[PDB]
Amino acid sequence: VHRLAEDFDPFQDAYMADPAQFVRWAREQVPIFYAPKLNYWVVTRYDTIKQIFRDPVTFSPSNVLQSFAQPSAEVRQVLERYGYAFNRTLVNEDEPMHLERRRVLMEPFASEHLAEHEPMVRELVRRAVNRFIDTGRADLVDQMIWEVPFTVALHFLGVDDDDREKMRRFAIAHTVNAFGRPSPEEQLAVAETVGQFWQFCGEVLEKMRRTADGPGWMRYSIRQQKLYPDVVTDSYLHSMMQAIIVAAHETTVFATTNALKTLLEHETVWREICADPSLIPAAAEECLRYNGPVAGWRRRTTREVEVEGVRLPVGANILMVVASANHDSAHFDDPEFFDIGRSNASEHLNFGYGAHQCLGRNLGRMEMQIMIEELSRRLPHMRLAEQRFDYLHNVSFRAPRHLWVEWDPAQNPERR
């Protein structure tokens, strides 16, 4: 058990594919251990992870987006060339200002505003499926799931038609860069794109200020800035366009990819939801608990504090294995049972808990559900192809990079 702690290394397929199994030894007998390879303390139980989430002052989110690659000087020269602000936004921002800015900026995330976005999401998903439904074999990631949540994020932000087109090239992957160990070349490539995107968003922001009463989160926040100029700076506003895209894009991509994989691998359940689409919200919620996109999430202590009887020093890094919590038999009865009727499925921790709890989780849920509904209605007869599933190595987000499915187009329901 001591060897397991000393050898712990999440940068390998076993942690990405089934992290809950990978740390089951710790969840059952070692609720906190130090991982030398990471200089992280690792917690694996639902109650422990809830305890850390619940106190945003003692357990700071400052390391949530900190890569495990050595710092790159070329990355900073590139970002400084583009005038990058290096702002911490809500997800990794400390108190007191975090909750004050959340208070001022959260209103457009309210569920009453969801119906405003649902038609655009349904239309996006329909058009995406139209592009491949007649082919008989598709990669659901590259051919639909990757792009939909990016474009939905742009709509939520209020990006105008013309700009959304020019932004397609900025829909790059950030997961390894923020949560993994990118090579020096990967660091530089991402930095350049982020600098260019910063530049572009600065021009979008100026234009949005010209039409500050129009729709979308950016315009709403511009109006809030006029009311609370000491809370919302120009640099923070500029940083939030990218922050919200990154928060909204790959998270939803991975959630939906995993959900489809789980549903198609549990064919009796795919059968049920094809016959009764009203089961889909519940089914998506248990997909998040059983095969959710969040393997782990991070905090850093700001004071000495006891966790599972160990006094952590100031500044200690903590890896919360959220996937292990979601499979914790001490909170979830029969946790390895994929049960879309599970009454407490929504107590999973993929959206966090407490001060930073995901602001867009119900938009994320809607996207998952609409994509599942479209595929179950129009391709009930598809199945997973024989394939290897590859996972990008990083501590936080897990999903197959591709998801090949196959079907007989002549049996498409819409041809009957």
Annotated binding site for heme b: 98, 102, 297, 299, 353, 356, 358
| DSSP letter string, 314-370 | TT-EEEE-HHHHHT-TTTSSSTTS--TT-TTGGG-STT--STT--TTHHHHHHHHHH
Omega before residue 96 within 30° of 0, cis:
yes
53 touches ligand HEM by CB under 6 A: yes
Residue partners of 126: CB distance under 8 A and separation at least 6? 374
Q: What is the dihedral of CA 266, 125, 135, 412, to 10 degrees?
A: 60
Q: Where are the beta strands (DSSP E) in 91-232?
A: 137-139
Q: Which is nearer to ligand HEM, 143 or 369 (CB)?
A: 369
Based on the shown chain and the rule CB under 6 A, indicate whether residue 358 belongs to the binding site for ligand HEM.
yes
Stretch that binds ligand HEM, among 17-25, 263-271, 291-299, 377-385 (CB under 6 A): 291-299
Which residue among 129, 352, 373, 375 contacts ligand HEM (CB under 6 A)? 352
| Span from 65-73, 222-230, 305-313, 350-358 in contact with ligand HEM (CB under 6 A) | 350-358
* Structure-block tokens of residue 64: 């949530």
Q: How far is the CB of 100 from ligand HEM (least distance, A)?
A: 11
233 in helix, strand or coil?
A: coil
Q: Is the Cβ of residue 156 or residue 200 nearer to ligand HEM in the bound state?
A: 156
Phi, psi of 32 (to 5 degrees): -150, 130
- Cβ of residue 302: shortest distance to ligand HEM, in angstroms? 15
Member of 154, 244, 263, 382 binding ligand HEM (CB under 6 A): 244
Task: Read off the tokens for 284.
Answer: 């998506």
Q: Which stretch binds ligand HEM (CB under 6 A): 70-78, 123-131, 165-173, 360-368?
A: 360-368
Q: Does 61 bind ligand HEM (CB under 6 A)?
A: yes
Is residue 124 within the footprint of ligand HEM (CB under 6 A)?
Answer: no
363 is an interface residue for ligand HEM by CB under 6 A: yes
Binding span for ligand HEM by CB under 6 A among 77-85, 137-145, 180-188, 347-355: 347-355
Tell me if 158 contacts ligand HEM by CB under 6 A: no
**252 counts as binding ligand HEM under rule CB under 6 A:** yes
Is 325 within 8 Å of 266 (Cβ atoms)? no
Bridge partners for 405 per DSSP? 138, 384
CB of 101 to ligand HEM, least distance (A): 8
Burial label, 112 (beta-carbon count in 10 A; 0-12, 13-18, 19+):
exposed
In this chain, which of 359, 375, 399, 405 binds ligand HEM, going by CB under 6 A?
359
Q: Does 125 bind ligand HEM (CB under 6 A)?
A: no
Q: Is 364 in the site for ligand HEM (CB under 6 A)?
A: yes
> In terms of Cα–Cα distance, which of 215, 177, 218, 214 is closest to 201?
218
State how far the alpha carbon of 318 is from the alpha carbons of 38, 39, 296, 395, in Å. Answer: 10, 9, 10, 11
Burial of 73 (0-12, 13-18, 19+ CB in 10 A): exposed
| 11: its two tokens | 């940068």
Q: CB under 6 A: which stretch of 74-82, 159-167, 170-178, 344-352 binds ligand HEM? A: 344-352
Residue 251 interacts with ligand HEM (CB under 6 A)? Answer: yes
Residue 90 near ligand HEM by CB under 6 A: yes
Residue 188 CB, nearest approach to ligand HEM (Å): 27
Q: How far apart are CA 247 and CA 102, in angstroms?
A: 14
Which phi and psi angles does 298 have, rounded to 5°? -125, 150
Counting contacts by CB under 6 A, is residue 360 touching ligand HEM? yes
| CA distance between the termini of the chain | 58
Nearer to ligand HEM among residue 47 and residue 267 (C-beta): 47
Query: Given the complex with ligand HEM, which of 354 and 413 has the nearer CB atom?
Result: 354
Least distance from ligand HEM to the Cβ atom of residue 18, Å:
18
Instruction: For the CB of residue 384, give the shortest distance to ligand HEM in the complex, in Å.
Output: 21
Footprint on this chain of ligand HEM (rule: CB under 6 A): 53, 61, 90-91, 102, 156, 244, 247-248, 251-252, 255, 293-294, 297, 350-354, 356-361, 363-364
